[PDB]
Amino acid sequence: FEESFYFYQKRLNERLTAPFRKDFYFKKDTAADLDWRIKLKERHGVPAKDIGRYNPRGRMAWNDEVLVGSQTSSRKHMVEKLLADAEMRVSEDGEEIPAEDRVPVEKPMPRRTEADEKGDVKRLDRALDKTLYLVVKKKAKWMFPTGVVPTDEGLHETAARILAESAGVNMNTWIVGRVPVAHHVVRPVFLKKGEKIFFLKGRIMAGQADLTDNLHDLVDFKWLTQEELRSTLAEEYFHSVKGMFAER
Amino acid sequence: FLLGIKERKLAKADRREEYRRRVREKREQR
Amino acid sequence: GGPELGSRRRRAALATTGNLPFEQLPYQCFQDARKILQQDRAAKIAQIVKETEKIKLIEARDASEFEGGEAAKQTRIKSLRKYIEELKILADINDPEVKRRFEDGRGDMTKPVYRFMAERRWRSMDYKIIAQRISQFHVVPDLLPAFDPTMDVKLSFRGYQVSPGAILDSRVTEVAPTLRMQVFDKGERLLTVVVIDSDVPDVTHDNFKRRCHFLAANIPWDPSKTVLSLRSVGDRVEGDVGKPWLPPFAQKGSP
Amino acid sequence: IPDLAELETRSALDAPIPSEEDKKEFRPWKRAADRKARLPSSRYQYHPPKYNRGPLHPIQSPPSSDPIARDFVPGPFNMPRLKETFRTVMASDLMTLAYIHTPPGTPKKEPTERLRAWEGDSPYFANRARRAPRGAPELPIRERDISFRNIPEIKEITVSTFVPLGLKNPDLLIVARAVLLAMTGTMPEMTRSKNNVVQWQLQANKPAGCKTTIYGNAAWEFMDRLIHLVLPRIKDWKGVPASTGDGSGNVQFGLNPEDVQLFPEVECNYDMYPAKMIPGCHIAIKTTATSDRQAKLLLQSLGVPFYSN
Amino acid sequence: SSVIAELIKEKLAARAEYNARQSALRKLQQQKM
Amino acid sequence: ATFVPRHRRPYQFTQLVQLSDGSTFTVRTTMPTALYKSAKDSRNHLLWQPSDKSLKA
Amino acid sequence: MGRDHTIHAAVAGYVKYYRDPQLHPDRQYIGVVFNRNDKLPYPKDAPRKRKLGLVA
Amino acid sequence: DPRIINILRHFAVLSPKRIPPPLRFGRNRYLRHWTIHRAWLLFRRQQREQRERILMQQHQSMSNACEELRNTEGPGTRETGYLYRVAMLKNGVYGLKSIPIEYASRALVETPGRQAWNHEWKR
RNA sequence: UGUUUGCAAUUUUUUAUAGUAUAUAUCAAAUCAUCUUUAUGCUAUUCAUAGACCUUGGGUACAGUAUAAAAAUUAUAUAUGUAUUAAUUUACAUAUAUUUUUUCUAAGAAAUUAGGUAAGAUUUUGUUUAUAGAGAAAUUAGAUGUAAAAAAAAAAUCUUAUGAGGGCGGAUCCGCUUCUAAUAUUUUUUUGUAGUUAUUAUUAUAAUAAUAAUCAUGUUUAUUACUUAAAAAGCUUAAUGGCUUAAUCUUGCCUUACUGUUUGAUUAACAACAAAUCUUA
């Protein structure tokens, strides 16, 4: 619906926006002007490349809507037309370049990388449209980097140290702040001492985790999504950290 | 005005068709 | 192709186009937007079933259980009942045909949806005028201490609509006028019509007195009725005529 | 259920989607050509008036959201990548970064009247006028905490240029009006002088500049190119001054005439404007923040470096 | 334009009729003035 | 009588902005160019990438 | 009220100096009542007290 | 002067008398836009109430943690509420280096770059 | 056929039919200059048609991923080449004005125009924060807060009523008078404060309790109501008073800045008269 709405609004702007004056961008009798007129002629006078063929004036201006199952509104079609137009169609001397001689433009990169296909959970470029979470196994139960809070340091100063001792210092990270975003309280057994874990949100900009020579008894790590966390973390350990999750 | 150009355009079409016809008869004769 | 089908454009469009419901027109943005409203109305209806069953649980609950007694039990169901009425309107407020049927005057006024748009339209231009007449003509506080109209009333003399507070000729205002009323709430009630002339000059006491020119009671009215002829109040329609229509008049010299 | 019975039975939102056989025969281009005649016009002919002549005038004007209205602007055309970033990654960080805890049973804070009143036993204190704003003559707005219900965001941006030399060379104002037209995508409004200075040859009440204003998505897109395509290209740029801010949440800063021609819209057609006529601008960012520090924190979230000066 | 021609003729007749009444009444006013 | 002003907006296009990092995104602009490649941007600047080492009396 | 802000009498009555905090909170008015024992400002909900002023 | 005429021509086409007129839709056409408009705003309502729900949930996760942290004792010989009082300090939160620019500068993109992520980054 | 081409959608009115006043259609006016050739041309391809690689031509295309099948089509004069005629007749093309489609040199870039009327706006001055060039002094953007699901009930103190034609003395006249209604006032006796979304706890996805948010079916540039001391700005000229709920400002239409006569006042204009001032019909 968003694509259909954008395309629907792009044509309503064609009927209300002032026409496009090529004189203000292209000088008459130049490589750019000739290149623009040739491509404009193929688009049937429409100076835009992402609204198909539609004339805001004339006797056929009322027929602006598109029927069901149309490709013109898709994002793939929009990007395809904009890329096929970025290629020069006229040499610097004003002569049209042959069809087979035109140099195509470098196409964009695919949204799904090789990691998505391979399914490597230790890669940070996987699920580029979702938020990944660093989960580490302890010699076994999966969890986040955790540790005891000494008497000299605080909550944020302790989280920074544990992260460097567990995941190494080769990560460009930033602790959001001192406020904890979630807590998991394990009541005591009247015996065993309870635990009041306080989690601090963190964000990684670049780098990769390193478990070599870690101080804690850590074995493996993996960057999981919000959907894969509930399948890995325990029920009680997940119900307490799910409130910190985001939309994506 | 619009239909005026229409009628005057169709009128010129007949004249062009009369020229196309008559000139064709000469080409065949030659 | 007769007038029973609509205007010329419809009878003309209904002869050169294909027979297909308006909601089934194959348009991309129109069918992607209709699906958003479709699966939404299904959620509103799923909520009405959830809230209706919640009142049963509260209804079948001893008032003693509630810390506030029976007083706190009704204020909770009241908020629930009012919440359902809003869901019955939001389920059809986005329907494109409910708007078409209402604008064409073919809307069923017994349903909350049409009575909602009917009042929303009346409160846009007609209420602002009648509200002004009550103030500029000093109908308040003269006749009543305070008055806020809640229904529409359009009176026409001999088939001619009269503007609110318009000077009419003594000959035009000689027969009982036809009241084109319209109520916006459900149910059937008995109405009482009164026509009062509040400017009769009393020269003996140097003041004005009010005179009733018409009075009728026990007139059943529902949101489906629109026209009421004050001529036949006890003959055709049910009602008790307290005073027949008196031709309005004004002596020369008085305002 | 009686409630469901009160709903529209002839629901159009519950009809099945169109079919392929009926869609293949739906050819609007063929209907007009096949008709071979002009369809009679409808009897409903109401057009929005050119002037609003009151709330009780017979002919009324429709809202701006009505397509036929004279003020209708086509809706959004795309989702700016900057507004999607903020609402996705940064909206929660600002809330988590700046956050103060309130006990569960904390009583609501009642605001104090900033215009004091005289209270006492003196018979004169009764009808005394309210005291003046203590300190400054105008009351400053109070800061609102950054909670989950108040997330500072960008609202609009005003790009204004002042060309005093346009009073002598009228061609300097025409070029300035065209630069801001392409840079922002709107029709700038000409501005006039308000003071006279014989030393500067400034005359009041004469056109000496222009201005624009972009709202909604148009503002996020301007910041998208400004921060990621214009400012990085300025030579020896230190950042936005740390002193910018009107104490109410609006950040202001200007660009040199050599930095305005770096805009992708101006450099593409640079040879169309006369030489030495591309002016600077005073870019004013208006945000929903309620303080001077909340604005800097908002711009810091969008990748705007601030240099101390 | 099979059945629409009849409706068009009805529209044309409605217009040609008014144009006749307007010209038939405008002439009466010019005689009274 | 309050005048109802109309919007005077110039023609706008949909442009693909390819950053120096290779990433692309669509934007709304007035220039007719379809693809705008940026050789210098935040992804290629030291003020925005202080930790980046490649750009780095 | 006159052109020069002079307040005249529009009917035959008795002058009254009063304050109507309902109409305007910080204004003082002058009125004319038909009965000397009337008290202005009249309550907004009471009927208008008017005289015919006509002879038959 | 010739170049300036190219500018005046650009403003002339934007004159109120030159710009296109207000739209003129029929009923079936007007109703079709009425649903597209009635649905788009509803779509925004769903995206808003969803976006505002996550903000309320994330906020309630902190209130529960901070509230609990305010009652904890320790670590060691530390009075109750110490970590809470230290967790509410805003030292450098509103400074110049508050948020790292490397994170804020990286915005979303329709498609990734030649190198989506940099795993070879070294301190 | 004015009005956007798929279909009863604004207000009033005309006419006609049914109908016993209403209903439907139709017409006119108001609101608005939306631009309209159903293809006659273009485009692509092919087939003829010239010979040192030309003009003019006939076909083909089958259109929702809309299409070659209109992204904008005029007239006229001169003159040339091809070509044609009884002819500067016709067709074609250029040579270049000249006109129409107003669609291409920004009036929504320009005046401080001051009265009548209607609508809309409501601190504009100064002070102050910030802002390429820009400084003591140039432009621009800002400078209060609250509310917007919703109340219900008991008594009392007045005041009002062209309320009950109240009662009693002299229907609507007047002083005493109970009752009822309404506004206001008590800090008053309280009762209720939900629903929705989400969190936490208990209980068996639901229920209950607590906590938090909650104007929102609406282009978030939301909107609406209320509030924001005083001075200052503005209101034809000094000074004083006044106006912000208009006497200011903006815009539309206008020119009552009208003709004759006339009322009551300025505690009987100026401590007389006269020339005056305001107001009424």
Ligand SMILES: NC(=O)c1ccc[n+]([C@@H]2O[C@H](COP(=O)([O-])OP(=O)(O)OC[C@H]3O[C@@H](n4cnc5c(N)ncnc54)[C@H](O)[C@@H]3O)[C@@H](O)[C@H]2O)c1
């Ligand atoms: N708008 C309302 O009706 C409404 C209702 C309740 C509360 N609020 C409050 O007002 C503020 C803003 O409301 P909002 O969140 O609904 O505004 P919004 O962000 O959804 O709309 C702002 C602008 O963004 C555009 N937009 C919205 N979604 C888009 C998309 N997917 N792609 C491209 N453009 C898009 C809109 O059309 C509009 O131009 C918030 O504080 C909100 O809680 C708004």
Ligand SMILES: [K+]
């Ligand atoms: K939204």
Ligand SMILES: [K+]
């Ligand atoms: K003030």
Ligand SMILES: [K+]
């Ligand atoms: K005026």
Ligand SMILES: [Mg+2]
């Ligand atoms: Mg000022």
Ligand SMILES: [Mg+2]
């Ligand atoms: Mg300065």
Ligand SMILES: [Mg+2]
């Ligand atoms: Mg004036």
Ligand SMILES: [Mg+2]
């Ligand atoms: Mg005297």
